[PDB]
Design a binder for this molecule. Structure first.
Ligand code: MET
Length: 526
């Protein structure tokens, strides 16, 4: 197609409470996608951040008896600390309190208004403050609040809903039904997974109401962006929030990660529109309906892909999963592996300690770690080098073919994107490499047929190198330890050139050994 910066985003999270696993998972997926495109040698801009305005946040700050400025700044700081500890490679962390962001929101608003797509009207209806979401009466039901009093709750989330009757600026969303439908039909990969795409089409097929994009300022505790030309109104937190993707695309960022300039025209930085928006299923409508509608109105290009995973962007009754405690217990790369291996586009995942140990011991230690140790062992690799292969048998070639096919396959999965499938494909090949090794018994060959061992060892090292390269966006620190052990030069650790079989030449020396070297140490079953 065209050469631009591959632009991948995560949602920006409400700062009403501390960061937790949902946020870490969403930002993980964004990080992995970005990392894979970097190892393909593409330019990448990965974006994450915090949603800091609105009633929900203001009221959370009121509950803690602190000013919104101090509260948002403190919780935003917790998010940054958390993501730093998680060892992501995110290019920029945006906050909607940022002054440049507010300028962008005002430019976008003025466009919608000049286009004729904003009018003064009224919203009279249900609203979820916890989700900052307007709801029809079909999407609420009966429940209770903390006081046990009967109340209405959202069908979507189970949060308490309230009736709102306000003069509001309205966006003409109803006018964009046909164009949104055209967009879904013409780009059948634009929403992932496919069943969520089908949900969006059905919802839009039914018809769209107009959307309130302002609120009376008192309702918001004056914690929002004023509407241009009307200081009695505040911009809807979601229109403000979605705009973070446009803002991010227009920020020049220095080496320490501070924003230093806002460009006038997004084309200047070549990021917009996003190639992938990573979201949780709870915020699908905002990204797949509202967002493209605003862009169509403003005449901005639309995103290429929205991927909605099965977790809730935001969710205690005596049940905890602390990301850092787990990572300090089992390792950071292992935890990341586990989260991405275990969960597809569903809540069907088993996140017990029992299952974590099984995958750690089974896949990372027994399948991958053991293979790395065998092909670098002094016992088997007596000369500590990549040997030069002799002639290949049919069995050799069957394995070589699997290895040559693997890049093209994982690449497709990464681009869906479906990271779980990309992992399963790589491990299928690791399993095949192990079976080959068992078959050939290279420990026996050292004594018996040194020439045969050359071939078997070479194919093993090259299968390990390639699988590891493809696993490196998922296991960034361990992929480095593995490449060091194999003695793979830095240049061969990225680029599509190095997807090819045979990229590291024979005679390459292995890295230095360490006594009792741990790649993935097993954990007892308790
Ligand atoms: C533009 S994405 C906004 C997401 C929302 N703030 C949330 O936390 O769920």
């Amino acid at each position: 197609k065209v050469e631009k910066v591959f632009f991948v985003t995560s949602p920006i999270y409400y700062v009403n409470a501390a960061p937790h696993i949902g946020h870490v998972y969403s930002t993980l997926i964004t990080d992995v996608i970005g990392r894979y495109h970097r190892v393909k040698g593409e330019r990448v801009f990965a974006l994450t951040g915090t949603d800091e305005h609105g009633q929900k946040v203001a009221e959370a700050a009121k509950q803690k008896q602190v000013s919104p400025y101090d509260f948002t700044t403190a919780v935003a700081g917790e998010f940054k600390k958390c993501f730093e500890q998680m060892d992501y490679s995110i290019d920029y962390f945006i906050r909607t309190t940022n002054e440049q962001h507010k300028a962008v929101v005002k430019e976008l608003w003025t466009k919608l208004e000049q286009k004729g797509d904003i009018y003064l009207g009224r919203y009279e209806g249900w609203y979820s403050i916890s989700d900052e979401s307007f709801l029809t009466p079909q999407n609420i039901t009966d429940g209770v609040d903390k006081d046990g009093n009967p109340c209405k709750v959202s069908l979507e989330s189970g949060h308490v809903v309230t009736w709102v009757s306000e003069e509001n600026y309205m966006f003409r969303l109803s006018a964009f039904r046909e164009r949104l439908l055209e967009w879904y039909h013409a780009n059948p990969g634009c929403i992932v997974p496919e069943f969520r795409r089908r949900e969006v089409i059905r919802a839009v097929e039914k018809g769209l109401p107009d959307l309130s994009v302002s609120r009376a300022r008192a309702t918001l505790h004056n914690w929002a962006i004023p509407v241009p030309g009307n200081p009695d109104h505040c911009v809807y937190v979601w229109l403000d929030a979605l705009t973070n993707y446009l803002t991010g695309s227009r920020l020049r960022v220095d080496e320490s990660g501070k924003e230093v300039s806002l460009v006038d025209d997004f084309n200047e930085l070549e990021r917009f529109p996003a190639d992938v928006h990573v979201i949780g299923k709870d915020i699908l409508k905002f990204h797949a309906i509202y967002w493209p509608a605003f862009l169509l109105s403003a005449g901005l290009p639309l995103p290429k892909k929205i991927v909605a995973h099965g977790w809730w962007t935001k969710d205690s009754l005596g049940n905890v999963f602390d990301p850092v405690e787990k990572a300090e217990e089992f390792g950071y790369d292992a935890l990341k592996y586990f989260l991405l291996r275990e969960s597809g586009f569903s809540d069907d995942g088993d996140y017990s300690d029992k299952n974590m140990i099984a995958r750690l011991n089974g896949e990372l230690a027994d399948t991958l770690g053991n293979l790395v140790m065998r092909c670098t062992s002094a016992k088997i690799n007596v000369n500590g080098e990549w040997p030069s292969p002799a002639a290949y048998t049919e069995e050799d070639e069957s394995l070589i073919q699997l290895i040559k096919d693997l890049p093209g396959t994982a690449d497709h999965y990464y681009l869906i994107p479906d990271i779980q499938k990309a992992i399963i494909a790589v491990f299928d090949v690791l399993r095949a490499i192990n079976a080959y090794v068992t078959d050939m018994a290279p420990w026996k060959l050292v004594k018996t047929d040194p020439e045969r061992l050359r071939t078997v060892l070479y194919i093993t090292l090259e299968g390990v190198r390639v699988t590891t390269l493809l696993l490196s966006p998922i296991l960034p620190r361990k992929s480095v330890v593995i490449f060091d052990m194999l003695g793979v030069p830095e240049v061969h650790r990225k680029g599509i050139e190095n997807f090819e079989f045979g990229a590291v030449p024979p005679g390459t020396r292995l890295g230095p050994a360490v006594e009792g070297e741990v790649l993935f140490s097993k954990r007892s079953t308790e």
